[model samples]
Target: YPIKTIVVLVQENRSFDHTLGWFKELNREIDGVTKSDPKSNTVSNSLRVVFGDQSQYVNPDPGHSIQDIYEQVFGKPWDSGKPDPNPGHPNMSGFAQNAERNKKGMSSAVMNGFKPNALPVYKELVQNFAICDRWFASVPASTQPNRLYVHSATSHGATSNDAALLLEGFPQKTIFESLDEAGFSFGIYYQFPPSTLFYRNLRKLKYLTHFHQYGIQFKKDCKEGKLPNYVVVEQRWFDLLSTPANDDHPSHDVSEGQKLVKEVYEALRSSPQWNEILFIITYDEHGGFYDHVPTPVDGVPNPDGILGPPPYNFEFNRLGVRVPTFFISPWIEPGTVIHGPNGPYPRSQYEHSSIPATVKTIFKLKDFLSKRDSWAGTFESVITRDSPRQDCPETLSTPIKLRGTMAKENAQLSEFQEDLVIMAAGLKGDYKNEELIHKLCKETCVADASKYVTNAFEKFLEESRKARDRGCDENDIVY
Candidate 1:
């Protein structure tokens, strides 16, 4: 048996129905939708879509914040028949109404499925690999919290995007620590410094990862067969005048994001160790799109001092909307669509913690890190094969549409982007250099920012390693 290496590719903000739901049109068992609600006149439910040119230009990014999603789930009492409750059931009806509420003027879209032809690469990947229709974002919240779920199965009870909470870092043990404890090698590659670097425990041992600009290192690792046992490749963040955003986080083109997925798949497929690979393709959260599935109720709360009162008094008892998720590997059967666990003890539904659960199961780690991952349904069941396939596709990359441009002269920073800028600045503990910092954040930013942060973080890692090598307390025990 070839030692199976697990890899993860992350994109941003798209629901399973909005993206892969159209996949069901081809593979009916995959839980997809092919049409909009006919009664919808461009601003209600799944029917509110403009169905614009399926090129790389996406318009009118929708809102998925906690309050935004709250309205999405249960419309303004002044709005639809969107009454709050059915306590045990999530009707998933407010999507169209929510889109109308937010976009105000649409590309006139919401709860609409992208034409499958628009994303030939995703279509092909799904047809070739496995799709998990039941896989959902960990919370009914937005990016940071859901992303945290991947890092620490428990988001420390975060319900929205708070860079303070994110950069402040959570004390919970990450899978990286678990991997270190179990003596397993792992790596995290991102277009730039991953937000995970902001994580408290992860930042402390940042040197443990061979972090870098994802493009070059990714191909190098794949081509050289130097892939680690567990690897996470992040999609690009922040769109600029020069290059388009490929993270697929909406307002950014889905086609550009498609290119990223293709490139990663191609690199992995062509690797010398292709047969020894299992990779998962997934998103952070729904990005406040529409999905048909309701959240599962059996949730374990993971608030540990890092969190305070929940927004809306939400108990962390449910999940967010479903997002597109699939596994690809030569070791697995083609067209495998899983809704229930393939494990000995099945979970009611799987969420982000399942990644850690799978990792724990694979490495036999003693410490579970938290309650959510301690019992979360793992994907160990997805890897059922006596032999790896020799006929895995030679290449998976394909051209995708690229459109639109944001001028580099001025920075059109949204609140989220603004927060990320501050996040990069916060790394050195204080921002003393004004022009250098803000200018780098201003125009010729991503390049200079990536350069500076990479160098700074590299130094931090080196110091950390040397300190640990000599056994000294270079940093205080904040944890």
Candidate 2:
């Protein structure tokens, strides 16, 4: 294999049209936005998809709940009593209305897309590498379920950010565990506690060696060429006393995300493994942003037999909105625009499950995690050269920071912050009160949440270490 190392950096919510749609001007081959595209709502005949809006933070996050997505795609709010029998062709006409509903007033926040100048790191990287314009989120839901797909290939029938799974942890096997069993090495470098750790199997004491702090161990490993076969780099999910969130979630600065991408690229480029490494940058979901393309709904499969609860049991037969996915490697041709594979049925489109499926193929892993990865498309085809190219840049240009008010640590918690808090509670084995958790999250600020997370994760590590000292096995819960 020409590629020896794979580094996946999965950022927070952002849709392809919301972020990279403007790139169509540079290359018409990509299926990005055009000036003629119109998203309609009662507030206006059509909301213009403007660029260079001077605002990087989306004040009120758009609605992306499973029902919200149904409305956005089908142009009508979902009736839990029954699935839309006529669920006609997805016109993608409900985004603006959904945004208005989420904001509790008329708003076109989701209709806007970022300009190339506003995100220099992404602009430069996309021009020099390969970008898959059709990559969709595995599920049409919120953070946890979509993120779960990145590692496990299946959210185990979770269609929402279900709290039960968060507290008990998902029981599905992950690529990390599979790699370990196959005698291959993997590591997770996180600025925040990774959502991947929500997998019960990953919480084992033996897996502690695989978790590395974002910069220190990561940079050291890169410089010394001691990096593992697979690397997962997680972004900072919250604003701290001094640092702002780099996860790129709504209401957060996109410039910080650009900075993080630049740092990761520069660090990897300085390593001896540079020539043989493939770096992937992708978002977990659309985060309720507007995108022009229709999601692939036909011929999709349900990963496991588990059915989602509700008035309507989602069969997992369709995919979420399109998210931007970039493939960077020395062997890839410049200005390459990737599309869906011309393979049979379920392998046609690229989704989050492609991450694990592609890894399984590259490393020659023995088995698939579930029906999703087994049927997902693999991306090894993007690397079209037999040898690494010498013309790849050693460093990328600095990202452009939008001039705006940065997030303060005293601000109220975002939805994702609340999820983190809940996950922390689970780690401490005290995640019992739903009413209390939501009430506290509503009242908590970023600083308090950060402090709580830090102390809780530290306590978890301390307890796990004690269990390790006692020769406890995977079956033992540290707390």
Candidate 3:
């Protein structure tokens, strides 16, 4: 009964098998090879498939820096920097190829040396609670769209990175909206502005509150019991530049992630609100990390407004490649691993949407969205005991500074660039038409300026209308 708060920490792309494969103790040689085909339901070894000149064996390494293994298994080197154009190959042959390679490799470099055998904290949580080994992302592979599934139930068939933008105008109702309706408090503590723009239009609504970009402030708020009922924290993307140069690259480094996790725990524990908190730490998507499990087609829903004629039969329902996910809560049973649907009721597979779905269930919110909403596993199993520990650590004043040197002192800006900046600022709640008006300069800029200004004004009006519709008082509307 000691768990009432939920914190969701989402890291970048990575698959569960890539990081957790070492847990099985298979020889390194057995890594990076796919073992089973979900399509044909057959298992095959990479070494055995390299025989024919048919070139089916020339597969690329998907997640980890197991390129040597890739060459050995596929008889060729994979293209670096750029991933395969068709990363999600849904056909029978593509399925077999991926299955054969993934079965033998570490899902990702993040878990290269991760002491899975000695995950004392995880083990403790699992034993007393639930650890979902069969959870999968909504898409069979990729980041933005999969993250979209977490925010809103559907990605609308966005298979590539280019399609992901601030989902501001999409008008979909997210869990945040539902939580607000149910009178729950929530806040997003991002590293910088516009980080959550993919759902920007949603943020514009009064339901979602954003924290000033300060990690220290976040910790302070949590300790004071000022933390919202739901909280989301984002790390700086530039931190990846500091990662050591290695094929077995650790995503965000274990120590860094653990430190952040510890900070949140300490903050909650020291506060009078210690008894009602649950923290979930997980990556957003497997950053091309490896995983042995074949993605199922069940969870993914067709994109809502994909550009095509009616009833397109393209297989957009494939789950993204497998990635690692972990849950930390006072209610979790120590050392428990919740095996996937080899049991009953809810079938095993879960994903990003599962997080929101679980939240909805806990609050008993009726406005759940997406097909995955029906399939999410509840965290009730983890909230077993009500024993509040008095030993929760005090919040520490951790000073984090980001240091970087730009090579160029001052680059000349193009006219187009200047216009773009004005546009971007307007979008981010900086200025109404006032700043844009000055930037446009009325005289000779009349005709073209009028058109551009008109568009900007239209956008401003549209946003204003949305804010009012969402129940915000006119004074509270920022831009």
Candidate 4:
């Protein structure tokens, strides 16, 4: 009766204020950033500092680690950055200071956001569809745990982008399992290997499709009016020296990503089932970017019911800053904007886990994946139509040219890639041999490290299959 298909395209990094805050000029009351707002709990009479000349590529990726977030929120250095020992209110003014301390104290570049028209495609889509102004990341930390929460509703008590994530993933039931049980079709599309591969539950690789395959499959599915119930398009991680990353993760050209963004929108709209879908576009985390709004502290606490990773030993008490999200559909008014708490969690607002919650509600899932998602605010309130609208803009603005080229050399192994590599190496002994895997990487037969690791991931999945087929004993998959 309501929307049937949901497409979630989760891109890397870039915050709400960083990317879409500039959109506030189009609509004054959209809860967007006011760069000059006075920051509370500051001894130095500091105001919120936000720079607008953001380059698509943010080299050295602004520090978004647990400790980095610690400095950002607490308004202190890590030496004294023990988060609210007395547990008072968060200052929400130390982002610039966090950047200064992490990089150089002279630059507020981390706090600076994008100029108007900076992200033409993203801005175009957000302005045309419903927008969520209050959605925060599931966790207040880095990519791994936040991403883990997206699929499994928990991070298994870790906050750091731990390389060990490969070996053991979030210990919980995933949407994939639930979907399969519910007999709803779902798929994950990716250019680089889908991060979903890192999760042990998905090692079967039954739901994976390459981005190229997605391009072809989507066209056929759309025309046939047989698109899957749920779909995820992972932005090409902003890495790979030879490849241009379409994901706007810092240090990667945003313009190149715009091309990918447009194409995804094109595919969705082209589908005969276009009107049957609600498409969501957003980032994984804020990537240490600035937001004028304070994170809701009285929100969901650590779901582990125990202490989390060290240094921060985060209890997952607070949520991260808001990120840009486009709630796209012809049914939504062209200029619709939404704010405040959408569903449950009256103390705070919407968040990434809302994706799962909304999916659970739409498909009538059997159970909540975890307490985090259980308390998450769902999106049923936003879709206010029994009939789908047939009119919405189909074309998006031209993306800006690359501000600069991303170099292949000096290329870094993001925590994600490194974690995969570690997984490949760690499991090599159990799977078969680590030497040839190392040989492929070392001999440069695989010049691309991510490709090498992705291939290894495939290898392990094969190993996992054999392990199961051979009747090896384990919970999910042995290796």
Candidate 5:
């Protein structure tokens, strides 16, 4: 009853049923049937589709980019550079292959492929907390817009990956702005600066009090007592063999994700701040993963004021697909599993925007900024309703000290200053290579490159120094 903080840990691409359905020991079962062949001995029904050995569904594909796969199967190409209203064509086999590959890769590449015993800390958290079995991504699917939905409630009908363009001039309000107006403090911890776009105009860089690109800073933040009322932790994208990779994906190996999870939990639990904290770990979208349940339609009102027909399309939303979501708090009951309707689907519908809406409710704030306010299922109904646990050990504490001062100084650079220098350098055609440039530009004389170079250098140094000084370590005597 005394919970004072909420932290949302959003991970990337993973469908619900693909990751959790295999854990029969965990009692998490998928609602839909896999496509099977009629010639097979296994029982089959209209709702229960079965696949043949050679059925496209049997072997999943992992190589197709999100857009290509959507187009090949669904006949609806994902609009990456423009807006489109139709959902992509459905290639059941391709979808199945993608899901199978994801699970296989996760098992072999990480945590030795999700070994339950190896993930003791996460296992403990799951046993002591709750898992939502019916959660689905907001839209029929993709990243940027779904993320927008998570933060702002409405995607403005965006159907693809054009975040930079879609976010401009949108009238929809966000829960973040709502919370800020109500005087609730919040902070976002990102692995990179680009992710700040997700918050839209809700808060500026100054409001993001804590920034950590590496995982090691958790202890330092906890020790300093600087945790905000709301915290969003982002996972870094790993690079392997010159290609970008997600650290939490099966490719990074489940063990790697487990290690990160363990470190976060242990750091918090071992800190003095664990008692009043609530943790929600969920995936952003089911990274092109497979789910069996059809998305349900129930919340929107019809022209006659009736509520049941799926508003987005002609079909009734049943269930989108399952993805992994875990809720943790000292007040939560151990080994609890929640199986209900979640997403915008009919049974137990919930979407990413619901997260912010629920956070609003916890603080008793009246506004629901995003579309989620009308749809999100409140945690108050399922979370521990009695007095919160006071059994935390006093010995759990952190060492307070500054971190990343050395790395900060080493990586300083100036992009804007560099641009000015390039402009000036082009003006100074005094260089011996001027003839080559003139031939290419079809001009007799080139600009003074030396003057441009000098001006740009001075500007770069001044700006770089100023930025470095803003974050420079006070203890470092070298200027």
Candidate 6:
């Protein structure tokens, strides 16, 4: 393989148009929307895609549940009372209407997206590397499921951030496991605890060695050329008393997210493995944001044989909204616009499952994890050159950090934050302090969740230390 290290940096909720809508002006080949587009929501004329969102936060965070997504894509909610509510074709109509109905924040806010040149890091990366303009989230639901698709190629019937799976880790074979078995090294570098840890196979003592904190060790690994074959770097998700979240979930400043991206890019650019690295930056979902493109609605297959729960019984036959995805590698041509892999599937589209699928191809993994990844489009073709480019920049443009706060420290937890709290509880397991984190589920504020999750991370580090030194049974230690 020409690419030795694949760095996957999956950020939080953001849509293709919401984050990179203006890229069309830079590269006309990119399938991007413009502010001049006349598209508007059905409910109100005010609900149209607006240009130049100045505010860093989308307060209240738009609703993105499976039901909400149904409404967003089909112009109405999924009604169990009806014979079949699905329109079977995505009009890309219901975003603003569903946001208003969901009533988390101002409906029009979902209609507005970032302006051109607003995000320096993203703009620099786009001009210098490759953007996958058609990449969609694997599932049309929420964070956990799409994120799961990135590693495991399936969510195993989950359409939401199922608490049960969070408590008892999802039982699925992940790319990490496949890499381990195939003797291809991989590591997870996380700012906070990784939600990727919710994969059951990753909780054991041996696997714990692969999890590294994001700061010092990450820089050291890059500098020394000790980076793994695959590395996933997670962003900070909570706004603690002292620090702000950089995950780019609604209500957090996008500047913080830009800062995180710049840091990662610069680290890798200066690394000994720079010439051999392919750094990928993508989002987990659209987070109820507006995207004009229609998702693949026909001939899509379920990842596994499993069906989604309840009244909907989603057959997994469609994809979620388009999310911003780009590739940074010395081998890629500058200003490249990437489309989906041809054939393989009836209507070829790139989704989160493509992450593992592409990895399997690049590293020569033996098998496919599911039908989703088996048919999922891969991007190894993006690395089109036989040799790396010397013109790759050593640093990206600096982000302009806003002076004001995005969310109040004492504010209630966002839905994504609540999911993290549940994951923290699950990580603690039967430990004595598990209830401390579990109780936060009933009533958790931003500060409370941040404090406990941070506390839980510290405790996890301590426990892992014991497991490493004393060679204790993996089950006896907390993760």
lDDT of each: 0.68, 0.81, 0.48, 0.69, 0.47, 0.81
Candidate 4 lDDT score relative to the true structure: 0.69
For TM-score, candidate 5 versus 6, the one ahead is 6
Q: Point out where model 2 deviates above 4 Å.
A: 36-59, 104-107, 344-347, 402-410, 432-439
Deviation from native of the Cα of residue 97 in model 1, angstroms: 1.9
In angstroms, the error of model 1 at 437 is 9.9
Quote model 3's TM-score: 0.62
lDDT of 5 by residue, 34-69 (tens): 323121111112122232212111112242344433
User: After TM-score superposition, what is the CA distance of residue 244 in candidate 1 from its true location, in Å?
Assistant: 2.1
Give the worst 10-residue stretch by lDDT in candidate 4.
Answer: 204-213
- Show the colliding residue pairs in model 2: none
Model 3: lDDT equals 0.48
Candidate order by lDDT, decreasing, is 6, 2, 4, 1, 3, 5
Off by over 4 Å in 1: 1-3, 36-57, 76-88, 205-209, 298-311, 342-347, 402-411, 429-479
Alpha-carbon error at 5 in model 4, in Å?
1.0
For model 2, how does the per-residue alpha-carbon lDDT over 1-479 read when each residue is reduced to its tens digit? Answer: 88889999988888898888888877898888766754334433555434223335544577888888887777778886767723858777777777776775424567777777778888889899999998999988888888889999988878878766776788899999888888989999988777777788788788876888887799999999998989999878887758888888876777778889999998988899998899999998998888878888887888887777775587888889999999999889989998997563544679999989999999899998988888888888999987788878777888654465444553777667777788787666556676656655676767778878878887888888888898888656675
Best by TM-score: 2
lDDT of 1 by residue, 291-322 (tens): 77766755444434344244354567667778
The alpha-carbon lDDT assigned to residue 147 of candidate 4 equals: 81
Estimated TM-score for each candidate: 0.84, 0.93, 0.62, 0.87, 0.62, 0.92
State the lDDT of candidate 3 residue by residue for 27-106, as single tens digits: 33222332242112222333222211111101222442223223222323346554332244233223223434555532
The per-residue C-alpha lDDT of model 2 at residue 66 equals: 87
The predicted structure with the larger lDDT, 3 or 6, is 6
